[PDB]
Amino acid sequence: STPIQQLLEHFLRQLQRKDPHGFFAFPVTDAIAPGYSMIIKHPMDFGTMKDKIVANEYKSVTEFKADFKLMCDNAMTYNRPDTVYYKLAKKILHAGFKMMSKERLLALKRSMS
Ligand SMILES: COc1cc(-c2cc(C)c(=O)n(C)c2)cc(OC)c1CN1CC(O)C1
């Protein structure tokens, strides 16, 4: 395992503990959500992101943040605002971007000197 992999696994774990029922743990299927694929063209989930970290598919924290935003955006695009999925996606989005903020990544960048 590499330093970037270790850092991405930490961010992922801290994000995964916000989803207790595992609604974002594995991909959304047409069986679980009717006509999902007709609406969501670029699907994403925590499990897909885990495989990518392991496969060393992330060159930056930005690439990781982009797949995380994608996951939350898809849940807010498919589901209406009064649903449990939309509300959880909104909360985990705000949580991930506070945790992976410019101020936090800057403090980290400066600690690598
Ligand atoms: C992958 O797992 C599920 C994902 C969803 C889900 C549905 C929509 C529409 C949606 O946008 N997102 C993001 C997730 C719903 C599920 O069923 C209640 C499950 C089943 N699992 C949950 C565990 O408790 C059983």
UniProtKB/Swiss-Prot annotation:
What's the stated role of this polypeptide? Plays a role in chromatin remodeling and regulation of transcription. Acts as a chromatin reader that recognizes and binds acylated histones: binds histones that are acetylated and/or butyrylated. Component of SWI/SNF chromatin remodeling subcomplex GBAF that carries out key enzymatic activities, changing chromatin structure by altering DNA-histone contacts within a nucleosome in an ATP-dependent manner. Also orchestrates the RAD51-RAD54 complex formation and thereby plays a role in homologous recombination (HR).
- Protein name in UniProt: Bromodomain-containing protein 9
- Subunit structure comment from the entry: Binds acetylated histones H3 and H4. Binds butyrylated histone H4. Component of the multiprotein chromatin-remodeling subcomplex SWI/SNF called GBAF, which includes at least BICRA or BICRAL (mutually exclusive), BRD9, SS18, the core BAF subunits, SMARCA2/BRM, SMARCA4/BRG1/BAF190A, ACTL6A/BAF53, SMARCC1/BAF155, and SMARCD1/BAF60A. Interacts (via N-terminal bromodomain) with acetylated RAD54. Interacts (via C-terminus) with RAD51.
The record's domain comment reads: The Bromo domain mediates interaction with histones that have acetylated lysine residues at specific positions. Also recognizes and binds histones that are butyrylated.
Site description Histone H4K5ac H4K8ac and histone H4K5bu H4K8bu binding, residues in chain: I32, Y85
Query: Which residue ranges are recorded for the region named Histone H4K5ac H4K8ac and histone H4K5bu H4K8bu binding?
Result: 77-79
Q: Where in the cell is it found?
A: Nucleus
Residue ranges of every copy of the Bromo domain listed in the record:
1-101
Q: What is the lineage of its organism?
A: Eukaryota, Metazoa, Chordata, Craniata, Vertebrata
